[PDB]
Amino acid sequence: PCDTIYPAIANQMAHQMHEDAQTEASKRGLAKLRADAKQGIYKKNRKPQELSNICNITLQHSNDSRNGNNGGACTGKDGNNERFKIGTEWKIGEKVETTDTDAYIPPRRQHMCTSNLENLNVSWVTEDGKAIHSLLGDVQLAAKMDADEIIKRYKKHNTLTDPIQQKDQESICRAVRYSFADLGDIIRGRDLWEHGDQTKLQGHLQIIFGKIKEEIKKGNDKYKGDEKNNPPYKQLREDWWEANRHQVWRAMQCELKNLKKSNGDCHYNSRGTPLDDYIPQRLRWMVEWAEWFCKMQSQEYDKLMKQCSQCMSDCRKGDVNCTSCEQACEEYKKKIKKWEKQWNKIKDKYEELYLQAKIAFAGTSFGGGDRDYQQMVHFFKELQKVTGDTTLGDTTSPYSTAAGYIHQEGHVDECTEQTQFCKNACKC
Amino acid sequence: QTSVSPSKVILPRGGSVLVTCSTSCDQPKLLGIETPLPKKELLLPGNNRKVYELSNVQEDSQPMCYSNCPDGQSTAKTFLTVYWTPERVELAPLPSWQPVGKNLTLRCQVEGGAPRANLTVVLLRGEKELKREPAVGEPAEVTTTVLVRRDHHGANFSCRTELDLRPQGLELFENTSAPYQLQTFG
Ligand SMILES: *[C@@H]1O[C@H](CO)[C@@H](O[C@@H]2O[C@H](CO)[C@@H](O)[C@H](O)[C@H]2NC(C)=O)[C@H](O)[C@H]1NC(C)=O
Ligand SMILES: *[C@@H]1O[C@H](CO)[C@@H](O)[C@H](O)[C@H]1NC(C)=O
Ligand SMILES: *[C@@H]1O[C@H](CO)[C@@H](O)[C@H](O)[C@H]1NC(C)=O
């Protein structure tokens, strides 16, 4: 539905997902995984660096195998200025055309500032035995560099004034928070985008943790046989992120500090650490697809009416104003059916998983074209019992459909004369 | 032309799974799944997409989707894997009383357990291993020989089945058997 008004529970579910992440990480080696960038070595440099305050970090604080360049993390990223160009087209993943991916990568995710982690030298991290702290250094580096890039490129690809509007400041804080959450799914092997760079990037990660499990084994280790999990080192990578997540976010606050908005979705700039990383990745991209879609519809709609203002306020039926309005009403329709084609695969994949959790019982695990079935249906299953909707045949819960999810937790305000993702002057 | 989601599934016997067949054609002639498993179609407004609730899957199953796209009938299949803990795990009937020095043989029976690829059995004395081998045949027969020494007078002997679903995403499940304490005399 889109009667009574239903509660907002996105923060309540990731909170339980945060409680479970902590409790099982404390069962294993959470404390022996806490790190700070000040305790690592970079460039095989043993000289004192001033990484107490992580804001003081620079590009030289990196185990990049190249680092002959000036660009450290954002090297070869968005050479066409389309990362935050409003209304840019989304892409599909690459893997073998088996169980075709409904994963639509956001534009900020494709041009993510990660060139340092992609060309990482695994030696300089594990040659010393401080691989934990030497790893958080490069993670906080890409985190702080990308926060500087996102706030910068969004203000250029959309040409924002000095008094930035509060809806745009909220749109950036969410974009930064979406970037912080994507990073956590990279470390844990939860990332959906399978590119030639990501596979090599994940190849360095597996090697690094393989030394980290043996690093804190100084005897009995709580990660017995973790190499034979999918993703590899599943438990160890999940625990490592929980230990240092408050610091990866503290790294980005060094760049979010200059945004003058402190309420709403920028509530996490100064206070606290956000819970977006414990919300599944397919959902965070669904709301981001909804945002850039509503930003795209508002543009095409205002362009349409500037050409067709004549034809409904006097244009005759064959003049320039009708052919001008003919192309405008065909170009506007050409764009929406482009995007709704993506929304069709999204809404149908969302429906497959929500109902999958009602009939599948304890001990059901999936593996296919995408890794994230097993984590997705478990989120809904815990969600379906918090809302109480597990009988197959109930529609009270608005989370029954994909559009109903964006109605509750999404933040799409800018769609004009059409706020509908749900349904159940052009011809002069 | 035809797709299926999900692709590889591991579920406990007696449960349910939801499989979806979809085609690139948006008005295909026919669309359905072919499996001997009890299905129950769930009515959705999709005309190029049909979903089925397969109930009480007891063994391995490989259903296939068929959709009638004007370009030629297309097919796509899924692979279901069933798992369950072994039913009977038991040691060979042996007397509690043994004299010193005798050669003792111990067999452990493993009835069931699936999938046998990820199922191994261990023969233990207290919490020390003696032999560790996968489970083959039903009942899976595994044996080892121990010489009777009287310093283990009253020590517990047991075997344990051990199936791990860690690589596929689940937990490892294990079963201990009845303990046999030998009484050494002489
Ligand atoms: C073999 O072990 C499995 C667990 O690996 C047993 O199934 C569990 O039984 C326990 C009781 O010990 C229950 O608490 C669990 O809920 C059961 N788990 C599941 C997933 O079924 C099984 O009963 C054991 N078999 C024998 C013959 O003892
Ligand atoms: C059993 O585990 C092995 C890992 O040694 C794996 O290769 C195999 O696929 C598993 N068996 C299955 C999934 O049936
Ligand atoms: C099993 O071993 C323990 C060793 O501490 C012993 O106390 C017990 O008597 C043994 N036998 C049993 C429990 O039948």
Numbering used by the authors:
A (entry chain A): 733 to 734, 741 to 956, 963 to 1057, 1061 to 1171, 1197 to 1200
B (entry chain B): 1 to 186
From the manuscript:
However, the parasite also displays members of variant protein families on the surface of infected erythrocytes, including the multidomain Plasmodium falciparum erythrocyte membrane proteins 1 (PfEMP1). These PfEMP1 cause infected erythrocytes to adhere to the surfaces of blood vessels and tissues, removing them from circulation and protecting the parasite within from spleen-mediated destruction. ICAM-1 binding is mediated by a subset of Duffy binding-like (DBL) domains, the DBLβ domains, which are found in either A-type or BC-type PfEMP1 (26–29). To understand how these BC-type PfEMP1 interact with ICAM-1, we have determined the structure of the DBLβ domain of the B-type IT4var13 PfEMP1 in complex with the N-terminal domains of ICAM-1, revealing divergent, but similar, modes of ICAM-1 binding across the PfEMP1.
The IT4var13 DBLβ domain interacts with domain 1 and 2 of ICAM-1 through a complex binding site, the location of which is compatible with a previous study, and binding is mediated by 3 types of interaction. A major part of the interface is mediated by hydrogen bonds, contributed by DBLβ domain side chains from a central loop (residues 973 to 976) and helices in the C-terminal third (subdomain 3) of the domain (residues 1098 to 1121). All of these DBLβ side chains targets the backbone of ICAM-1, with the exception of glutamate 1098, which forms hydrogen bonds with arginine 49 in ICAM-1D1. Secondly, a loop from the DBLβ domain (residues 1107 to 1117) interacts through backbone–backbone hydrogen bonds with ICAM-1D1 to add an antiparallel β-strand to the A′GFC β-sheet of ICAM-1D1. Such β-strand augmentation is a common motif in protein–protein interactions but has not been observed in other PfEMP1–receptor interactions. Finally, the interface is stabilized by a cluster of hydrophobic residues found on an elongated helix of the DBLβ domain and 2 subsequent loops (residues 1102 to 1139). This cluster complements a hydrophobic patch on ICAM-1D1 which has previously been identified as important for ICAM-1 binding by B-type PfEMP1 (27, 35, 36). In contrast, mutation of 3 of the 4 hydrophobic residues that contact ICAM-1 (L1102, I1106, and F1113) reduced the interaction affinity by more than 200-fold, highlighting the importance of this hydrophobic patch for ICAM-1 binding. However, the B-type binding site is more compact, and the overall structure of the DBLβ domain in this region is more similar to that of previously characterized non-ICAM-1 binding domains. An overlay of the 2 structures, based on the DBLβ domain, shows that, while domain 1 of ICAM-1 is in a similar position in both structures, the protruding A-type ICAM-1 binding site fixes the C terminus of domain 2 at an angle that is ∼30° different from the position that it adopts, relative to the DBLβ domain, when bound to the B-type IT4var13.
